[PDB]
């Protein structure tokens, strides 16, 4: 029994060991209560505005779309304190955690942006933060490991499995299984067991709400399409949510194509996986024929995850939202293009969203279209990784 619907059509649920069900029910209750609480909302609002830096800018590109009839705006979540959209929802979850009398936070991280957000929120609001991060990501997203540790968070390298996000997720959940009484699990994406996909969306929805208000002011109408990368679905659903009932507005999610879908080394379960049960949810999974969970791959640590949030699987199934993939090389080109022609360094995750938007424009340059890319974060963390790759060429 739950207060809210755990499912999005077939997808979602609460597939956790029985031991964690009361934790999840307590969290859902706290959330429903907080959402109705004007004091919680004012405090959340205050942190978002005066601490995080909201509203973020909506930037019109005026170089990269030259010679085409595409008008492109970037929603500047890269400008948010911490350097990614991740900060929005961790601030809400941290308030919920305190509201439930918890003094410790458990988080997983891949890009290290959620980690950094979990650490900064915990420093601010007086929580003891421990962070699980795959050994591979500790290395390829190193700047964020320094940032996290400087802010007093414990960072725990995970060497198991693919040594990436999936494996960090494993350890975080295993930990929480034994610590839920004292620790709140600050899940970093719109995935996992109910109520997380719902909570993460509601604590990210200001992205799309601001975008709507901003684009109306600048353009006098809604976007033709909003475009966002999909790691587990938080930034995309944050962008999409307020636009779902606006049927003219295309909703486009971009999964990591990795080295190529045909290689199997990708992170695109929504379009190239198969429904399964894992990480607390029934959702599209990369899995073997036997039902073992496949390891994913992406150049982008924040997208390198073999599953995806249930509301996206849902929104796709009914054809409300459309999902595509962009490869490493496509994402890199878009990374370079933004750097050199708009003076903005995007996260390699965000670069996937931009790459597809650039494809939309390039494929049909005389098609009149007003596009918004959610620039989920900045690429300071990717600096060395990108350098090492380009040098190797």
């Amino acid at each position: 029994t739950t207060l809210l619907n755990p499912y999005f059509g077939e997808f979602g649920g609460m597939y956790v060991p029985q031991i964690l069900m009361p934790a999840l029910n307590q969290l859902e209750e706290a959330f429903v209560s907080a959402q109705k609480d004007p004091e919680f909302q004012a405090q959340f609002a205050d942190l978002l505005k005066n601490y995080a830096g909201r509203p973020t800018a909506l930037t019109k590109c005026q170089n990269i779309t030259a010679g085409t009839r595409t008008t492109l705006y970037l929603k500047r979540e890269d400008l948010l304190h911490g350097g990614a959209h991740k900060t929005n929802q961790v601030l809400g979850q941290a308030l919920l955690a305190k509201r439930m009398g918890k003094s410790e936070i458990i988080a997983e991280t891949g890009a290290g942006q959620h980690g950094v957000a979990s650490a900064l929120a915990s420093a601010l609001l007086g929580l003891k933060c421990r962070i699980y991060m795959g050994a591979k990501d500790v290395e390829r997203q190193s700047p964020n490991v320094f940032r996290m540790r400087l802010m007093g968070a414990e960072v725990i390298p995970v060497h198991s499995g693919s040594a990436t996000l999936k494996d960090a997720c494993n350890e975080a959940l295993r930990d929480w299984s034994g610590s839920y009484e004292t620790a709140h699990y600050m899940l970093g994406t719109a995935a996992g067991p109910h109520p997380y996909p719902t909570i993460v969306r509601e604590f990210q929805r200001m992205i799309g709400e601001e975008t709507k208000a901003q684009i109306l002011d600048k353009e006098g109408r809604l976007p033709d399409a909003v475009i966002a990368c999909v790691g587990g679905g938080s930034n995309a659903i944050g962008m999409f949510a307020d636009f779902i009932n606006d049927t003219s507005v295309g909703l486009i999610g971009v999964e990591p194509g990795g080295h190529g879908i045909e290689t199997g080394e990708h992170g695109a379960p929504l379009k190239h996986g198969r429904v399964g049960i894992y990480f607390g949810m029934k959702a599209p999974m990369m899995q073997t024929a036997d039902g073992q969970i496949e390891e994913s791959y992406s150049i982008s640590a924040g997208l390198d995850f073999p599953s995806v949030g249930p509301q996206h699987a849902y929104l796709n199934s009914i054809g409300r939202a459309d999902y595509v993939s962009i490869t490493d090389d496509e994402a890199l080109e878009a990374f370079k293009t933004l750097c050199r022609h708009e003076g903005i360094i995007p996260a390699l995750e965000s670069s996937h969203a931009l790459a597809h938007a650039l494809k939309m424009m390039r494929e049909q340059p005389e098609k009149e279209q007003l596009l918004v890319v959610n620039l989920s974060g900045r690429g300071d963390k990717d600096i060395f990784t990108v350098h090492d790759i380009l040098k190797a060429r």
């Binding site: 029994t1 060991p17 029985q18 031991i19 999974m285 036997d290 969970i293």
Partner: protein, 266 residues
């Protein structure tokens, strides 16, 4: 009706059950089959057997490594069912319980899974990441194919959960000794007396305590608390891990442990 018959025989003998767990195919199919025969011979009242899964979320490193050893041996769910059939052929009456993760059950159809279970002579299935709230198609398909669906009664169980576990489950109730994940080092200390009596009140399947049971004293304590018996997993698996290079000494040490654990159940 292997669980019903066992608990009837054990109560008649004023005795608790000892249930060892192993991962099927750890460290290889041949040695694992030998391991299982040794577990029975040393006095296992029932067996809990794991199908190697890629991401065992309810498991600490000991069993995590049991899954990996099996995978290193190339062990598949399909080869596990060949083993089970072979095990059932040799031992017609011992209850056999499976420890599953949901995806392995759901993968090629929940009904198809339980039908195969029955086909090979499995008696029960525990799905670690399927709480009572999500169990409907699982427990229905189980019952359809004369398999007992197993449910965990956690230390933080409220009354409504207790009554759900009592009604939904069959064969045995899994009485969880503590929060956390599997592990022989982490021992459950919290008294379970309150839960056992409530489960007996609601006519739940006989309770077996599991998680952190690695010594005969914990088996006896479990029995004296009113439980129908005790389950040891990580403790068993640690002997496999420790004796990988000494296959004969492995079975020797396993026999000693099971025999000691079973003695304390009396």
């Amino acid at each position: 009706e292997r669980y019903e018959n066992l608990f009837a025989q054990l109560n008649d003998r004023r005795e608790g059950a000892f249930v060892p767990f192993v991962t099927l195919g750890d460290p290889g199919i041949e040695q694992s089959l030998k391991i299982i025969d040794t577990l029975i011979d040393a006095g296992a009242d029932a067996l809990e057997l794991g199908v190697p899964f890629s991401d065992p979320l309810a498991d600490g490193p000991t069993i995590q490594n049991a899954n990996l050893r099996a995978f290193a041996a190339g062990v598949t769910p399909a080869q596990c069912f060949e083993m089970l059939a072979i095990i059932r052929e040799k031992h017609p009456t011992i209850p056999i319980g499976l420890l599953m993760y949901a995806n392995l059950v759901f993968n090629n159809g929940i009904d198809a899974f339980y039908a195969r279970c029955e086909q090979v002579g499995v008696d029960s299935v525990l799905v670690a990441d399927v709480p009572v709230e999500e169990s409907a198609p699982f427990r229905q398909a189980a019952l359809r194919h004369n398999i007992a669906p197993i449910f965990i009664c956690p230390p933080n169980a409220d009354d409504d959960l207790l009554r759900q576990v009592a009604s939904y489950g069959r064969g045995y109730t899994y009485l969880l000794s503590r929060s956390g994940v599997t592990g022989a080092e982490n021992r459950g200390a919290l008294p379970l007396h309150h839960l056992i009596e409530k489960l007996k009140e609601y006519h739940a399947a006989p309770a077996l305590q599991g998680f952190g049971i690695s010594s005969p004293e914990q088996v006896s304590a479990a029995v004296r608390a009113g439980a129908a018996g005790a389950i040891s997993g990580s403790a068993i698996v640690k002997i496999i891990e420790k004796n990988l290079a000494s296959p004969k000494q492995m079975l020797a040490e396993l026999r000693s442990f099971v025999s000691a654990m079973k003695a304390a159940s009396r």
